Amino acid sequence: EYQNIFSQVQVRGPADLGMTEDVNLANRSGVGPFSTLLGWFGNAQLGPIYLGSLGVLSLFSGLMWFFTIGIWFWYQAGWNPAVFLRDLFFFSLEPPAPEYGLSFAAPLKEGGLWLIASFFMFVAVWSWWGRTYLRAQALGMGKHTAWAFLSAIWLWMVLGFIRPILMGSWSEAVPYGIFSHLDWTNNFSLVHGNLFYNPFHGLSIAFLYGSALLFAMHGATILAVSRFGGERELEQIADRGTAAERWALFWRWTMGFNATMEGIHRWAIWMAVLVTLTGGIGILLSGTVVDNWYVWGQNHG
Amino acid sequence: ALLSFERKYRVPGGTLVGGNLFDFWVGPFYVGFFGVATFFFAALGIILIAWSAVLQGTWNPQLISVYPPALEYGLGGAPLAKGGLWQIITICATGAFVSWALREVEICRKLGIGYHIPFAFAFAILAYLTLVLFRPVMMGAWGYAFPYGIWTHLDWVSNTGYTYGNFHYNPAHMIAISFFFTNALALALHGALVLSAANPEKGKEMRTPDHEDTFFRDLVGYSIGTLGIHRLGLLLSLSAVFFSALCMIITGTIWFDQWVDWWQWWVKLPWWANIPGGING
Amino acid sequence: DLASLAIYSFWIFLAGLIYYLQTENMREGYPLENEDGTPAANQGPFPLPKPKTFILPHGRGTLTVPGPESEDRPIALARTAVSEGFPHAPTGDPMKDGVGPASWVARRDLPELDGHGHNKIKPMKAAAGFHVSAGKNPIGLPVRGCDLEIAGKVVDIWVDIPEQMARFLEVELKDGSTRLLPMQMVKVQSNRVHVNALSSDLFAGIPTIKSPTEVTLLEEDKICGYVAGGLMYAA
Numbered sequence: 146e147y148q149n150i151f152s153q154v155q156v157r158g159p160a161d162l163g164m165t166e167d168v169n170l171a172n173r174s175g176v177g178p179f180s181t182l183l184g185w186f187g188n189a190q191l192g193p194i195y196l197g198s199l200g201v202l203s204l205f206s207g208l209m210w211f212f213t214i215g216i217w218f219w220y221q222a223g224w225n226p227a228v229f230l231r232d233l234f235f236f237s238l239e240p241p242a243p244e245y246g247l248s249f250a251a252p253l254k255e256g257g258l259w260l261i262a263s264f265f266m267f268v269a270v271w272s273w274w275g276r277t278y279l280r281a282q283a284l285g286m287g288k289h290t291a292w293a294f295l296s297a298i299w300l301w302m303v304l305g306f307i308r309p310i311l312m313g314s315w316s317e318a319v320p321y322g323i324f325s326h327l328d329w330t331n332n333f334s335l336v337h338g339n340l341f342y343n344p345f346h347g348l349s350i351a352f353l354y355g356s357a358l359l360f361a362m363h364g365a366t367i368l369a370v371s372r373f374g375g376e377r378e379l380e381q382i383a384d385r386g387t388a389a390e391r392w393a394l395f396w397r398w399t400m401g402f403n404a405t406m407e408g409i410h411r412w413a414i415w416m417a418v419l420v421t422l423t424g425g426i427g428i429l430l431s432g433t434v435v436d437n438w439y440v441w442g443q444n445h446g
Numbered sequence: 447a448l449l450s451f452e453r454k455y456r457v458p459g460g461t462l463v464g465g466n467l468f469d470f471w472v473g474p475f476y477v478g479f480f481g482v483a484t485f486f487f488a489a490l491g492i493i494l495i496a497w498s499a500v501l502q503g504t505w506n507p508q509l510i511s512v513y514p515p516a517l518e519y520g521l522g523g524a525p526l527a528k529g530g531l532w533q534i535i536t537i538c539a540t541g542a543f544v545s546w547a548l549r550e551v552e553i554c555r556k557l558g559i560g561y562h563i564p565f566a567f568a569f570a571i572l573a574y575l576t577l578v579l580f581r582p583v584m585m586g587a588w589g590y591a592f593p594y595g596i597w598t599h600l601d602w603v604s605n606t607g608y609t610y611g612n613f614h615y616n617p618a619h620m621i622a623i624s625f626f627f628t629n630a631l632a633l634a635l636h637g638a639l640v641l642s643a644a645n646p647e648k649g650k651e652m653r654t655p656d657h658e659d660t661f662f663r664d665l666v667g668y669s670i671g672t673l674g675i676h677r678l679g680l681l682l683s684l685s686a687v688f689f690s691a692l693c694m695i696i697t698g699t700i701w702f703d704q705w706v707d708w709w710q711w712w713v714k715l716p717w718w719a720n721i722p723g724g725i726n727g
Numbered sequence: 728d729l730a731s732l733a734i735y736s737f738w739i740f741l742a743g744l745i746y747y748l749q750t751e752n753m754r755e756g757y758p759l760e761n762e763d764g765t766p767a768a769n770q771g772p773f774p775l776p777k778p779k780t781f782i783l784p785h786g787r788g789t790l791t792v793p794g795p796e797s798e799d800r801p802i803a804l805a806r807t808a809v810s811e812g813f814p815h816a817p818t819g820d821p822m823k824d825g826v827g828p829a830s831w832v833a834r835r836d837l838p839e840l841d842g843h844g845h846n847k848i849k850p851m852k853a854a855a856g857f858h859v860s861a862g863k864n865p866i867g868l869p870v871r872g873c874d875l876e877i878a879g880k881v882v883d884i885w886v887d888i889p890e891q892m893a894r895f896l897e898v899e900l901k902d903g904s905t906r907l908l909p910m911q912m913v914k915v916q917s918n919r920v921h922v923n924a925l926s927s928d929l930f931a932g933i934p935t936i937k938s939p940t941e942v943t944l945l946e947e948d949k950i951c952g953y954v955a956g957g958l959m960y961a962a
């Protein structure tokens with residue numbers, strides 16, 4: 146009758162400053178405020194973030210990338226806030242022309258800025274990745290988040306760095322712009338014989354769709370058994386409870402096979418990770434090895 | 447045939463139709479009236495698809511395709527050869543899916559759990575029904591619906607998109623896509639977080655959901671928590687699909703020109719429409 | 728061709744992924760059993776995985792799963808047919824007997840511990856500095872069951888300290904004792920709490936807790952099991 150999508154009653158205690166383990170506490174901030182708004186759905190505590198040196202690097206980097214595109218956009222607007230807001234989605238920081246290959250000789254206005262921005266992003270994301278690892282280590286947890294995040298990084302690395310290098314030009318890489326980076330995507334598929342014929346693209350789709358199927362299933366089913374404490378997945382892993390049993394059996398009786406409270410999360414981490422993994426291969430091969438997926442598909446090979 | 451703990455749950459009751467008539471299992475599968483219903487619809491569907499295949503003249507699964515009635519038939523019926531089989535197969539498909547959902551409700555009742563799963567499924571069924579039933583009806587022919595064939599259905603998606611230019615510019619579709627990507631991000635993280643607490647560094651003891659909250663706060667400055675993440679997944683998922691249905695129900699109907707051009711509402715807004723410079727002046 | 732090898736390799740990869748994943752999901756509930764508890768003939772095409780051991784925190788031992796599976800419990804049910812696949816009738820009161828949607832698991836009879844080794848769930852009384860922060864505060868509200876009769880009064884919220892979340896409402900019945908009702912099975916309203924699962928007369932039958940200021944995993948399971956079962960068994 147009551148569905149547990151939003152909480153009926155929030156409670157608040159003293160700010161939870163977290164588990165210590167080996168974490169260097171001098172680099173945790175204070176707690177942030179509490180948001181009753183968030184608290185209807187998730188937790189209300191915004192609070193402590195860890196900002197060490199690798200964190201500060203990433204944050205500085207990320208902002209420089211973003212501001213580098215920013216002043217280009219403002220400059221494209223002729224320094225006018227009305228024009229800037231008006232054409233926000235049409236502005237684009239485009240990579241250097243094919244003329245300049247993989248060099249850094251292109252002028253700032255005609256590629257140089259793209260690379261500066263790109264440099265700043267590269268350092269942003271990798272430093273953020275290492276951070277993903279280091280936070281796990283300080284708490285003595287597994288490295289799954291880092292390894293899963295690498296699969297995202299793969300697609301991104303293949304889009305702006307690996308593929309451009311292999312194809313001999315930076316001009317091949319994705320421009321920074323809302324509408325412009327959409328055009329790039331459509332232009333990529335057209336120029337490579339329609340990516341619907343790339344077997345990896347289609348596999349990427351199966352996994353992206355599959356991630357919606359699975360998290361729909363999983364969120365729905367864990368809420369279904371939340372009346373037996375089902376969201377307490379770790380303890381249900383260590384001491385199976387009627388929540389885990391009824392949950393397994395929903396699926397056993399429905400589709401005839403089923404998971405464990407731990408094992409479903411393995412299905413999760415993989416369904417997702419395989420989206421960008423298969424995807425990144427699909428792009429890497431495109432133009433390096435296969436010029437046209439219609440044609441390749443006519444022979445498979 | 448049973449999991450080590452299953453017997454205590456295989457009690458009578460929970461059915462919506464038929465009382466105890468169909469209240470039983472076959473292997474791991476629960477049956478019920480809607481087990482019998484989906485089986486029937488699914489089997490009629492496959493027999494019709496199989497028979498449609500013989501009339502197309504093929505048996506290769508990468509060539510079988512049951513095309514909807516050509517646009518000339520409008521919203522009426524077609525000969526089996528040339529539209530009818532799709533229409534009937536669609537009737538069977540909806541039968542099979544809706545039955546599958548109602549069967550899931552029955553399993554839920556018997557198991558004493560919440561109805562969240564079939565509710566979630568209902569969204570997928572609605573997506574399907576938008577493409578095969580609601581949109582074609584507003585448009586005025588079954589021919590606008592997609593055909594049932596591995597690659598022919600991908601041909602349809604491509605031709606339907608490019609009717610409206612680069613379909614990327616459909617704004618409902620933009621929101622759709624964002625939910626899809628965000629959902630898959632959220633799935634990766636959830637999967638990996640729980641696994642990283644259940645499977646700590648070699649020799650160390652299982653961590654605790656406090657560690658999970660701690661980890662994420664350390665990292666991004668916030669943690670949604672273990673109830674939240676399950677609500678989030680369900681909401682990102684259903685939202686993706688909600689917007690998928692929307693972005694198609696409006697295409698062909700309220701908006702039918704090139705989607706890129708729809709964005710001129712913003713740029714022509716009177717207070718900045720005519721200011722020089724920028725991309726648009 | 729390089730792509731044609733890439734895709735071929737991947738299908739083999741994915742095949743072994745699925746194998747790994749499906750065997751991983753056999754660490755519980757297996758080896759399959761017949762309805763009489765003996766081991767089924769046909770266990771599927773996948774073998775049981777090599778065991779893994781979880782080190783449990785706070786000196787609570789390990790868990791090694793796939794392991795000897797048992798209910799550690801009498802199951803009050805009897806066959807209703809002379810062959811596989813039919814339902815199994817409760818032999819007494821399924822609510823009292825913990826069967827069906829009233830089922831519970833014989834989980835460990837200690838409370839779940841937080842990351843500091845303190846009881847995860849506490850009554851708000853003992854929960855230092857914890858107060859209701861948004862929404863209607865149910866404490867003081869009469870509790871009504873599906874028979875539109877008053878079953879008792881709410882006397883506290885039992886809260887999850889780490890996750891800062893309501894988990895039960897402690898309700899006081901006519902005789903002065905208390906039961907816990909899970910948050911997920913009550914509807915808080917401006918002037919009552921409504922429990923649709925149980926009729927007012929089934930509240931006394933809710934499983935009680937050994938100590939009034941903690942609840943154990945075994946006990947959460949009996950309570951939640953009992954209250955869920957009412958949806959089927961009160962009606």
Ligand code: BCL
Pocket residue numbers: 233301304319323326327330614619620621623624625627628631
């Ligand atoms: C995958 C193949 C194409 C591609 C195809 C598409 C298509 C098709 C669409 C998008 C859409 C999006 N893409 Mg793209 N996208 C690609 C690679 C990228 C990369 C990258 C670093 O590689 C980034 C950052 C983005 C960013 C984005 C977002 C603007 C938007 C929603 C993403 C989302 O839900 O994220 C995950 C969710 C998160 C919460 C992470 C953070 C989200 C924020 C909003 C990221 C945006 C940062 C950006 C700099 C801020 C905007 C600038 C302001 C206007 C000032 N794309 C590649 C090249 N992308 C959708 C859109 O709405 O476009 C208008 C869309 O329809």
Ligand code: BCL
Pocket residue numbers: 341346347348350351352354355358492495574577592596597599600603
């Ligand atoms: C959603 C928007 C478009 C569409 C766009 C795309 C695009 C784009 C792609 C696909 C792809 C696929 N689509 Mg499609 N697809 C649509 C509607 C459908 C419907 C439907 C009943 O409405 C079905 C059954 C499918 C089925 C499929 C699969 C054949 C393939 C992988 C999907 C997947 O993993 O999903 C997630 C689900 C799971 C992981 C669960 C398992 C799903 C199984 C595998 C479905 C099998 C279907 C079976 C072969 C046919 C029916 C069996 C009958 C009994 C005869 N599509 C609509 C019209 N689809 C991809 C492909 O590679 O095609 C070649 C691809 O690139």
Ligand code: BCL
Pocket residue numbers: 207269270297298300301304329330331332333334339340341345346349350353420421423424425427428603627630
């Ligand atoms: C007309 C266009 C073409 C087409 C062109 C392309 C191209 C080109 C590409 C895809 C790609 C994809 N397409 Mg396609 N695609 C088409 C039709 C479809 C259809 C469909 C129903 O028709 C579907 C469902 C898809 C689906 C997909 C996905 C499966 C895949 C992207 C996965 C992903 O998560 O990327 C998003 C994930 C990323 C971009 C990784 C980002 C990770 C980085 C590290 C994040 C950095 C964040 C940054 C720092 C900003 C932070 C901001 C704030 C701090 C938060 N395509 C048509 C046929 N598609 C991609 C792919 O893999 O193809 C094989 C790709 O390159």
Ligand code: BCL
Pocket residue numbers: 330331543570571572573574576577602603604605606607608612613614619622623626686687689690691692693694
């Ligand atoms: C050239 C083509 C155009 C384009 C044209 C279209 C068109 C046209 C459509 C989409 C649709 C979608 N596109 Mg687009 N799209 C493009 C590029 C992209 C890109 C990209 C990265 O560039 C992305 C990420 C997307 C993303 C998406 C999704 C938002 C949406 C598909 C999901 C959906 O509807 O699921 C919904 C899920 C279903 C319909 C399946 C439900 C399953 C049913 C209920 C059960 C079936 C059971 C099965 C038969 C059982 C068999 C298995 C048994 C075990 C045997 N598109 C390009 C530019 N896109 C579609 C959409 O929004 O549809 C509503 C759509 O129609």
Ligand SMILES: CC[C@H]1c2cc3[nH]c4c(c3C)C(=O)[C@H](C(=O)OC)c4c3nc(cc4[nH]c(cc(n2)[C@@H]1C)c(C(C)=O)c4C)[C@@H](C)[C@@H]3CCC(=O)OC/C=C(\C)CCC[C@H](C)CCC[C@H](C)CCCC(C)C
Pocket residue numbers: 203204206207208211269270271273274277290291293294295296297417418419420421627628630631634635665666
């Ligand atoms: C399995 C593949 C999926 C996946 C997985 C994945 N992503 C991940 C991870 C994982 C496992 C992480 O661990 C990591 C993470 O930290 O998650 C919380 C991450 C991450 N995925 C991200 C994004 C992302 N992932 C995507 C995709 C996917 N990620 C896939 C679907 C996408 C898509 C679909 O496009 C995006 C956009 C990041 C949020 C995060 C990595 C963060 C990072 O690298 O940060 C560098 C630092 C910066 C970029 C700082 C930039 C600042 C902002 C640009 C501006 C903020 C606005 C400001 C308020 C304005 C100020 C201006 C005023 C002065 C006017």
Ligand SMILES: CC[C@H]1c2cc3[nH]c4c(c3C)C(=O)[C@H](C(=O)OC)c4c3nc(cc4[nH]c(cc(n2)[C@@H]1C)c(C(C)=O)c4C)[C@@H](C)[C@@H]3CCC(=O)OC/C=C(\C)CCC[C@H](C)CCC[C@H](C)CCCC(C)C
Pocket residue numbers: 354355357358361362365399400484487488491492535538539540542543546550563564566567568569570593594595596599683684687
């Ligand atoms: C709503 C959010 C997401 C979602 C959720 C969701 N799906 C679900 C559920 C939920 C909650 C279930 O409970 C249910 C399930 O059991 O999952 C394991 C299901 C399910 N989602 C499924 C598939 C599926 N879901 C998809 C999508 C999504 N499902 C979303 C992304 C897709 C996509 C993206 O394409 C597919 C392919 C099934 C695995 C399962 C439902 C099984 C079912 O209905 O079985 C009964 C019917 C049959 C067994 C046979 C049907 C025979 C037909 C009569 C003939 C064939 C007609 C068909 C139209 C032709 C197909 C041609 C194609 C080549 C295009």
Ligand SMILES: COC(C)(C)C(=O)C/C=C(\C)CC/C=C(\C)CC/C=C(\C)CCCC/C(C)=C/CCC(C)CC/C=C(\C)CCC=C(C)C
Pocket residue numbers: 211212214215216218219260263264266267301302303304305306315319320321322323326
């Ligand atoms: C509001 O006004 C101010 C000025 C304050 C602003 O701050 C405004 C700022 C903005 C308006 C910012 C808006 C920015 C965008 C619209 C950004 C959009 C970005 C995308 C859509 C990006 C998509 C994809 C990008 C990809 C795939 C890039 C990948 C890059 C790499 C893998 C890294 C490649 C590195 C290179 C080429 C450099 C290598 C060189 C070496 C020397 C190592």
Ligand SMILES: [Cl-]
Pocket residue numbers: 362363364366367409
């Ligand atoms: Cl699940």
Ligand SMILES: [Fe+3]
Pocket residue numbers: 363367378410636640676
């Ligand atoms: Fe989970």
